[PDB]
Design a protein around this ligand. Structure first.
Ligand SMILES: [K+]
Ligand SMILES: [K+]
Lengths: 355, 355, 355, 355
């Protein structure tokens, strides 16, 4: 609610072409298909093959930025990105070779930031998951057995064995309800009463384990990435020690590209930003182009009014952002700082029109 | 638990008539129907058409409050609210024109506040959703493929292709369990063990992404809307800077209409209110009608007793509200203020009966 | 994890007999049943009828505690508890009268505390639910329509109309998957991809709305019920103002009955309690029976050791309870208080064995 | 995200052999099976029987650590671990005796820590669960009845009675959707609209009850287990009282085994650790082997740089761990302590290469 993300977060075309490449697959999977388009997209494999293969050697030139790097992941696929279809092309002489389109599926995961963010937390908290995972296996067979107790007599064909019910156990426990084979007696139907009661309570925790400290990491992601852009601000030598921890939880940094808009004039003033790198277009008679290490919105927030200037993204700006309350927090947190933001709320009135 | 919402939050009849208008549809959708009521409700389309169309031109008079406004949304439907049925009435000479009752469905969304509140946060946090959305697509086809590996032999008619399983993938992953086509072998049935394990863990996060900072915005909604009604209170020049941030998170403001009740006498005293605009009916021998900028309940909360007066909504009051603890917080937070609320807890004892 | 709830929280037999009374129903609902037990439990209706009816008149004596009360709820059922079967007994001369066993179902809800706790919060927050409820209805028919677009041709018998799909809409949206009527084409099967994506995201919020501030109320329930038992402690004149708000969130009060155990000796010392009303059995050579307004566990917690005495519930004690950290918080929060709890950790060493 | 768990958390082979022992079962459950492998795994029961039975008597030697213990749980299964198959072996002369493989299922739960952690909290909070559990039973039969109202006429075979719908009630309420018997009329199909609305809102709370304070206990688990390793640090005589409560919530302690790696050089410096027991391999020209009561990472965190030394687990170290922010918190929290960590950030520069 407080951030302006722009400039192609879904940028790399390597990330893009995994999708069309795999939709090329299915037409080969279908009988009664004319051969025209059958091979027409087989080329497109050779394209994306050739395309990453074109990208590939440029990556194998890893003399770029070669000081200290960890590119075992980013290379791990690019090797097999082209070799696996190639050997598949020959030995699997039949068309089944294209079933080695199970290969590009990591290419999205290649430059998938937020996936290392995933695996980071599991190696602290999966301690829980295991004991739950065991406990899941406990309750699975602890409960799955109770059905073999009963309908083995008149449902041999369905419940004549154990795993046939362990099947129906999880399908019954895992919120699903397929509906191929269901009991007929009373007491067997009694038993389900605690099952959905369980599996929703079980995963009531177990799935909850995930968002539990995942949120902490992501709530932490906006600090670890943003204890940067702190000393850059020339004013923040005087901020109190514990002041920052109170603030940066809500501060997110994102980038805007050149030419875009940042805040339009006359819209209801709801937030203020800190510039730390780049430049803007403060739409005024004399444009007050504030570059790295600036801010704006106190003109709108102290008074609680619409906007005073159509600030637009003149260049690619590494932006911060901030809603009122946490600036009201700052105004509340320090009379020393509102002194200057009082002056700023007067300087930028005349200084907006003047040079 | 701490607020008195009244005065027709579901007020505008424009919001109302979307519902009956669309229930007018279905009778046309049914064979063996006599023509009597068939067209009888076709009028009601012409009513609601005519009704909004009556409202319409009054809205096209946008010389009301015409200083600075953003009514591109509120007009966006009202135009097509009437044009689309109209052109549909002629060119679709057959009765199918009423299938352009897909049009009014934004009219609830027209004056749906809390929908802009929805879209506000997605443009900060959907960064996550995409990488999850990709990751969802990863795990979809990463897993959907594994079924074509197997039952292509003896289930051509069901699993003779890829998307036939991608269907069964999400139906299996998305907690659903339709139950038309299910495997027969062992190992294919092994594979589901991690699927519900996944999709509940996947959406264990992904849905959790939504309420995550949505709650922040709504927890923020009760500050941004309520840093107003702060300086209105004549007593709040002395409140400490950080004092307010501690408080306003729980303070919600709502309005009561005239004539209603606010707190009845003798009920267990559980909360106190701040009046800032309007008037009340302090049911006492001499009614102490406190107008804009007042409060009541300290008579009930310091002692922890039932109510001292049947305060009733005499006029339409922009109300605040407050349970004890956060007033005990305030009483704890400041001895300077309990001094006057000690006096108030004595003045309003004699001043309740006297003038 | 920090509380000892005992003394029959599920106490009143009025709450109990709703359950057996309704299990009396089903035997009448079944053909090929001999008449012996058919009427045998019809008596048990006359019992529970007669039983509450016996309780009833004692309740109609509402001259007990008749000073100020709100018993419109608790009477509301007791009236119809007996009248509705009675008039049902005659006019419904056929056995169907017992279908007015839809009546006792409020009797659990009669003395169901925690149900007023439920309805308390909805009248602050259902503002959200409505706009979501509308939005649910938006997405329902917004999406339900798209199926009538398609399979009306070759599924008249199933999708020959609108509500036949609105049925399949919610069954598809609401996580369920019945599996009677499912599409056959491609594009109609494409559409489900956003549905489970939606309904899990929709109720990802909407159900989340419930626990959102419900937890606040229940987290508040342990303060509003426990700003009592505060001044009772003779030591708490010196506690700081903001000190209590930090503490009482974790403090829960419950009662133990006489004769029970409170903490057994030699078990790992993990918590300490505050007595405020009742008496105990401090199992020592000279039993140090501490009555209203006492505590114990600092002997175990400062040292971090097993228990020093088999404290057992001698009488019915209105107990508090407290784990270490929040007492370490208190020890950390105040050196003035650890002074006496240092003395207490020495006095109760010799005073435990001596008188 | 901040911890290094190693050394076989899933250690005891008693915990291990429950799994293979029960997979031994199913082959006996299957007709048309040759007798070769039929009995081959019957031995493996005699193995695991004999195996725990071998472990058993060593456990019955409970003269180990026999000072004060509570081993009623850990013995509770080991007794029946061997007796129940044994008596089952004879009296159940038919092969059904192996259906007493319902016995080992507690053996995982025998040494399942985190299961006592489960049951700890339920006896504080299940107060809620009951009133919800009742309320679940309310809404069950309150709603289950409404179907018998209707389709008794034309669905006797399916809805000719009450419990046949109570079945369909929970299957309809519990998110499941089996799909054997579904209504046909309009109004009966109307009724489901509030059901999924309910059960997802019901378990929207009820499952939420579990993670609610479970998280508190687990968030508490990392303090109660870690108010230890506090005074061990020779530097923590000067820490402020409330300082620790702020910190230890994030501090988790885990152990590394000998030989493992702790932090590798050149990786991006993201965290620092506190050693309190054990020794390390500070990979430098003169290895600065810091033993019990040490730390490292300030060299990497004040500057925000990669690692300065391949610290590796020389011995089995009871480790702590800490990301930056909470050390930046500490650096912010105390200028007295950054004084020494300024010196440490200079001493360990020259002291890393020197002795
Ligand atoms: K189904
Ligand atoms: K389902």
């Amino acid at each position: 609610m407080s951030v302006l993300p722009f400039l192609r977060i879904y940028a790399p075309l390597n990330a893009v072409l995994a999708a069309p490449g795999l939709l090329a697959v299915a037409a080969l999977t279908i009988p009664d298909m004319s051969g025209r388009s059958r091979l027409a997209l087989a080329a497109l494999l050779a394209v994306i093959w050739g395309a990453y293969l074109l990208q590939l050697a440029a990556t194998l030139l890893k003399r770029r930025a070669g000081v200290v790097r960890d590119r075992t992941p980013k290379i791990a696929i690019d090797v097999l990105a082209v070799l696996v279809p190639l050997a598949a092309f020959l030995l699997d002489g039949s068309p089944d070779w294209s079933l080695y389109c199970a290969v590009w599926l990591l290419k999205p995961l290649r430059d998938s930031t937020f996936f290392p963010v995933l695996g980071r937390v599991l190696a602290n908290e999966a301690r829980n998951l295991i004991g739950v995972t065991t406990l899941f296996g406990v309750v699975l067979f602890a409960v799955a057995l109770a059905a073999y107790v009963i309908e083995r007599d008149i449902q041999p064909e369905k419940f004549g064995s154990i795993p046939q019910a362990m099947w129906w156990a999880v399908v019954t426990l895992s919120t699903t309800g397929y509906g191929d084979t269901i009991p007929q007696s009373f007491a067997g139907r009694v038993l389900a009463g605690a099952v959905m009661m369980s599996g929703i309570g079980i995963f009531g925790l177990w799935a909850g384990i995930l968002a539990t400290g995942f949120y902490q990491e992501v709530r932490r992601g906006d600090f670890v990435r943003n204890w940067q852009l702190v000393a850059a601000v020339p004013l923040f030598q005087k901020l109190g020690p514990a002041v920052l921890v109170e603030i940066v939880r809500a501060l997110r940094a994102r980038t805007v590209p050149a030419g875009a808009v940042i805040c339009r004039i006359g819209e209801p003033g709801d937030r203020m930003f800190f510039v730390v790198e780049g430049s803007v277009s403060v739409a005024t008679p004399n444009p007050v182009e504030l570059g790295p290490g600036a801010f704006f919105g106190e003109m709108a927030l102290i008074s609680g009014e619409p906007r005073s200037a159509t600030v637009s993204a003149a260049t690619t700006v590494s932006l911060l952002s901030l809603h009122s309350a946490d600036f009201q927090m700052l105004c509340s947190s320090s009379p020393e700082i509102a002194e200057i933001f009082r002056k700023t709320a007067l300087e930028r009135r005349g200084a907006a029109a003047s040079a």
